[PDB]
């Protein structure tokens, strides 16, 4: 029930479908996000029709990043720098040798580094060429920033049957209120982290300078938003409330609007579009912002 500024977001699509038999069709309906559909001249279509094929992710497997130790075969070794201030290039004083690295979880995310390794003492700033503004600047945190993301749309999985054998998992009706996914960042923690980072930024761009934070300038959704995975769903959160500041030389939570996309093409891959199956129940996840 209204208003006109809610811009739908969720679309209730009705369409034909092939059943198990190769004769009679199937008039079934699903619920897709606006980022997944696109109108054509109300009749819509999947946004990936004239891009590549599409395969539905199996509900058996999971996209949960689990620690993976990389090891070297016989005759090789992995050197590890064990200094507390290794800003990551050049000679290392205290070097140790190992066969297998520590548990590195492959968390695929943008803008905000999630579930990473905390830095030692002061937060670390790493760049291949600081004077070069085209090279990214990897920031590593010392104290993790508590972030909470939720999907207040506990959903239904309709198991429509595109036989013989195959079965598509559409999104049924929503039980409860029509709410949008969002992410909380503790205001105090974000203030102390930003104030600790700007003090390290002044060590490379002059002592008495002004450091201003602005969000992304534009482009695709995967770069302008905090793209990540949680519970199987792919969130794209608005990071305009975190990078909106201006630091001179000298109690609640910041909520961020998060969108959800099911048809993704990560790693800038063309040819393979994956349909994320809907996930039943309210999805809640608490993560660590450990770097930028």
């Amino acid at each position, epitope marked *: *029930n209204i*208003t006109d*500024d*809610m811009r739908g977001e969720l679309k209730n699509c009705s369409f034909n479908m092939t059943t198990e038999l190769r004769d009679k069709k199937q008039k079934v309906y699903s619920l897709f996000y606006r980022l997944d559909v696109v109108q054509i001249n109300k009749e819509y279509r999947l946004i990936n029709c004239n891009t590549s094929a599409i395969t539905q992710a199996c509900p058996k497997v999971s996209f949960e990043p689990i620690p993976i130790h990389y090891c070297a075969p016989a005759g090789f070794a992995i050197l590890k720098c064990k200094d507390k201030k290794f800003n990551g290039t050049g000679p290392c004083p205290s070097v140790s040798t190992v066969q297998c690295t520590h548990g590195i979880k492959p968390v695929v995310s943008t803008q905000l580094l999630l579930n990473g390794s905390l830095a030692e003492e002061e937060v670390m700033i790493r760049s291949e060429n600081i004077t070069n503004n085209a090279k990214n600047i990897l920031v590593q945190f010392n104290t993790p920033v508590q972030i909470n993301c939720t999907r*207040p749309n506990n959903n239904t999985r309709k198991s429509i049957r595109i036989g013989p054998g195959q079965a598509f998992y559409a999104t049924g009706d929503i*039980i409860g*209120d029509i*709410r949008q996914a969002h992410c909380n960042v503790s205001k105090a923690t974000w203030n102390e982290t930003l104030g600790k980072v700007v003090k390290q930024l002044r060590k490379h761009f002059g002592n008495n300078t002004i450091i201003r934070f602005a969000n992304s300038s534009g482009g695709d959704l995967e770069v302008t938003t905090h793209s990540f995975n949680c519970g199987g769903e792919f969130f794209y959160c608005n990071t305009s409330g975190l990078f909106n500041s201006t630091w001179i030389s000298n109690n609640d939570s910041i*909520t961020l609007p998060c969108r959800i996309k099911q048809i993704i093409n990560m790693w800038q891959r063309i040819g393979q579009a994956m349909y994320a199956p809907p996930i039943q129940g309210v999805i809640r996840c608490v993560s660590n912002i450990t770097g930028l």
Partner: antibody
Framework: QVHLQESGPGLVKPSETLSLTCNVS????????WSWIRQPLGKQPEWIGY???????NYNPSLKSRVHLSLDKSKNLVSLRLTGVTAADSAIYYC??????????????????????????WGKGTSVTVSS | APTFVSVAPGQTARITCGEE??????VIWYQQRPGQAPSLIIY??????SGIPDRFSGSPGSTFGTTATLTITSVEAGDEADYYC????????????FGEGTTLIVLS
């Protein structure tokens, strides 16, 4: 004390304009919401619409293009106009104050809430019969 | 269309009005004495204004899939009147017509 008195013609010819007046005593008409509720003989009350200052005034979608409400702040009263009356409008029209409330279920910031209205102090009511 | 609920004096009366709940509701109840004007009894599911005894209670507007229920403890002869409800659902448009009333009758 809050006293409300409704008053109208009582008899209105078909295809005419019904005009009613709700004389308010005990409070000002600018600091409150005002709603009109009509009720045919043996039927459930039908909400006509609410009127408030600063242009906040809504009507019943079923009678949207026929009803008109107004507030006389100089005479401290509530007015009502119903154009194109028929035999279905013959009912007992009540004038009642309206207090607003906000039912919050979501996160507030994302407009995940809704405002509900409720009348607490009603009036005696007026009888309107449409006949020619 | 009309419904009746007969309860012995001193017992407990229960009144059902409106369709089944689809989302978080804010049911407003009203009482209409025969020959008088409808009066406010319980607003915001179970919040009673000044002047209404605590014998009148309403079902919480947080249960999804149940109908609005008005419980009247210690039923007396004075409670014999009509009771209407104004359903305020977050999934349904604004109801400009009160639900079908239920007549509370003295026992026997």
């Amino acid at each position: 004390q809050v006293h409300l008195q409704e008053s109208g013609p009582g008899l209105v010819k078909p295809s005419e304009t019904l005009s009613l007046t709700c004389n308010v005593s005990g409070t000002l008409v600018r600091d409150n919401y005002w709603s009109w509720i009509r009720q045919p003989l043996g039927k459930q009350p039908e909400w006509i619409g609410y009127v408030h200052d600063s242009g906040d005034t809504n009507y019943n979608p079923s009678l949207k293009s026929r009803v008109h409400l107004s507030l006389d702040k100089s005479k401290n009263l509530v007015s009502l106009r119903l154009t194109g009356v028929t035999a279905a409008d013959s009912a007992i029209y009540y004038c009642a104050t309206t207090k607003h409330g906000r039912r919050i279920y979501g996160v507030v910031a994302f407009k995940e809430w809704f405002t509900y209205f409720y009348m607490d102090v009603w009036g005696k009511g007026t009888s309107v019969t449409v006949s020619s | 269309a009309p419904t009746f609920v007969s309860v012995a004096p001193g017992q407990t009366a229960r009144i059902t009005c409106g369709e089944e709940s689809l989302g978080s509701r804010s049911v407003i109840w009203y009482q209409q004495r025969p020959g008088q004007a409808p009066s406010l009894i319980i607003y915001n599911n179970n919040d009673r204004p000044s002047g209404i005894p605590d014998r009148f209670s309403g079902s919480p507007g947080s249960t999804f899939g149940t109908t609005a229920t008005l419980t009247i403890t210690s039923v007396e002869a004075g409670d014999e009147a009509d009771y209407y409800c104004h359903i305020w659902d977050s999934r349904r448009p604004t109801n400009w017509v009160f639900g079908e009333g239920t007549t509370l009758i003295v026992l026997s």
